[PDB]
């Protein structure tokens, strides 16, 4: 009264519509271009959400730019994983109410590769039966899970914020169960999924950056994603990325 997890619940971005036209047969171009446009709108919701996260607007504006530019795909993939889990038991990729990627759509050329990585996040969320509260704390933690090699400007403050959300996730795990050995075992399992997201997003961005730089594919990108991708392409090499892991 008020908990940080109830604040996260209030600020959780709404499920947006794709604006997909289903009165014309499917094609990979139409689906990927639509998911790109929808993706730019999801990035906007994520920035608006980050601004309401207690502690974030205390970081310097360059750190705020930095974390969103590094974490945007982690948020989208994780929230897609959550929706696909609750709505289909991780069988369908529930991008938008008007655009579900079912078995048929996955078989479309170029589709399956990016899809399997998304279905892995949802498979894991399903297999661990992640609760709403654990999901909200995990998602905040994914915004604070990658920083530059040399660090952020508000480093001590960033460390305070991340610790706050590591403790919120702890409380959501305790509330869900209440057994001390099973508590840390569940913390281990949830935190393992957070760690494994680094590789999921590394594969998502490697295909995403290939599609963005591909002159032949002609797949469109929204202006918001076009600018983040322009920055993050040189950030992968030389590697100015420090993964903040819970295990290793």
């Amino acid at each position: 009264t008020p908990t940080l997890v109830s604040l996260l619940e209030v600020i959780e971005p709404e499920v947006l519509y794709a604006g997909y036209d289903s009165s014309v047969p499917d094609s990979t171009w139409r689906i990927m271009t639509t998911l790109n446009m929808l993706g730019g709108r999801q990035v906007i919701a994520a920035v608006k959400w980050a601004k309401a996260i207690p502690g974030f607007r205390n970081l310097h504006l360059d750190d705020q730019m930095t974390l969103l530019q590094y974490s945007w795909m982690f948020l989208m993939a994780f929230a897609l994983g959550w929706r696909s889990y609750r709505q289909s038991s991780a069988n369908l990729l529930c991008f938008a109410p008007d655009l579900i990627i079912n078995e048929q759509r996955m078989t479309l050329p170029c589709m399956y590769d990016q899809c399997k990585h998304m279905l892995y996040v949802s498979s894991e969320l399903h297999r661990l039966q992640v609760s709403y509260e654990e999901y909200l704390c995990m998602k905040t933690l994914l915004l604070l899970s990658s920083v530059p090699k040399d660090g952020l400007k508000s480093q001590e403050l960033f460390d305070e914020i991340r610790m706050t959300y590591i403790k919120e996730l702890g409380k959501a795990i305790v509330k869900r169960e209440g057994n001390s050995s099973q508590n840390w075992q569940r913390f281990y399992q949830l935190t393992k999924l957070l760690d494994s997201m680094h590789e999921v997003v590394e594969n998502l961005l490697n295909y995403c950056f290939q599609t963005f730089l591909d002159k032949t594919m002609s797949i469109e990108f929204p202006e918001m994603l076009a600018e983040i991708i322009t920055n993050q392409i040189p950030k992968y090499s030389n590697g100015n990325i420090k993964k903040l892991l819970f295990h290793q």
């Binding site: 906007i44 920035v47 608006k48 601004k51 504006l61 705020q64 730019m65 969103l68 530019q69 202006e223 918001m224 600018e227 983040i228």
Partner: peptide
């Protein structure tokens, strides 16, 4: 027109925008 400091970044514009 007068000199301005309009922000070119869409991300930075979203981060500065109220409220």
């Amino acid at each position: 027109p007068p000199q301005e400091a309009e922000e070119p970044s869409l991300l930075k514009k979203l981060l500065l925008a109220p409220a």
